[PDB]
């Protein structure tokens, strides 16, 4: 995320429920990142237990998990796969995920938005008999929102004149099948 290594992991705590005494489990997601010096920062903790209960329990199992960074967007994408059955291609399955910003602030990923990333990044993690690795998430093409650095420059003919750094404030793009239109506002 933002060129720094982060890791996310999930811890389960035994909690008893009140006239009935029952073993119950609470799950919490935890985040950490590595500082410049090489020392790992404080683990910051998010409660995603609410989102976990809703995925089919199947007691004594571990939710499939997805971590990635989105290039164009500030946010980091975290998702919870449902139980993933032995076969793959299980689209349309409900995913409950979470948007985590740079600021440690976090916003809940809506199921509709969840389906977007679900659609572009499935098959990246799968069930028993295989373990799987997440690539960085991109919809079609990966391209900058903006460009502001002189990759090259040439001086005027007589050294009296020049073109000083001016930037490309906005870049947008639209994907078509085998066709691409890309828009610039120099």
């Amino acid at each position: 995320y933002k060129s720094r290594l982060y890791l996310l992991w999930l811890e389960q705590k035994e909690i008893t429920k009140q006239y009935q005494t029952e073993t119950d489990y609470r799950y919490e997601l935890k985040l950490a990142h590595i500082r410049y010096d090489g020392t790992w920062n404080t683990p910051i903790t998010f409660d995603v237990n609410k989102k976990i209960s809703e995925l089919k329990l199947e007691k004594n199992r571990a939710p499939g998990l997805y971590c990635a960074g989105y290039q164009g967007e500030d946010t980091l994408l975290v998702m919870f796969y449902n139980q993933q059955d032995t076969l793959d291609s299980y689209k349309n399955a409900s995913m409950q995920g979470l948007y985590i910003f740079a600021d440690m602030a976090s916003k809940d990923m809506t199921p509709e938005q969840s389906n977007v990333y679900r659609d572009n990044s499935y098959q990246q993690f799968d069930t028993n008999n295989v373990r799987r690795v997440n690539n960085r998430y991109a919809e079609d093409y990966e391209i900058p929102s903006s460009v502001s650095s002189r990759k090259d420059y040439g001086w005027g003919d007589y050294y009296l004149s020049m073109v000083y750094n001016g930037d490309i404030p906005t870049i947008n793009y639209k994907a078509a099948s085998s066709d691409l239109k890309i828009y610039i506002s120099p």
Binding site: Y164, G166, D179, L180, I182, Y183, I184, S185, P186
Partner: protein
Amino acid sequence: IVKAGGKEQTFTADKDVSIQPSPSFDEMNYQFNALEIDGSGLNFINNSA
């Protein structure tokens, strides 16, 4: 001037600059409304171009 694929494209200021800056030696700024650029080509090299 823009180069992608096999076709050069060109975008002159008179046509694409909505408002033009007062003439000054110090600094002059041209803002271009939008520019359209062809895709596929350019042809990708090792998935990057």
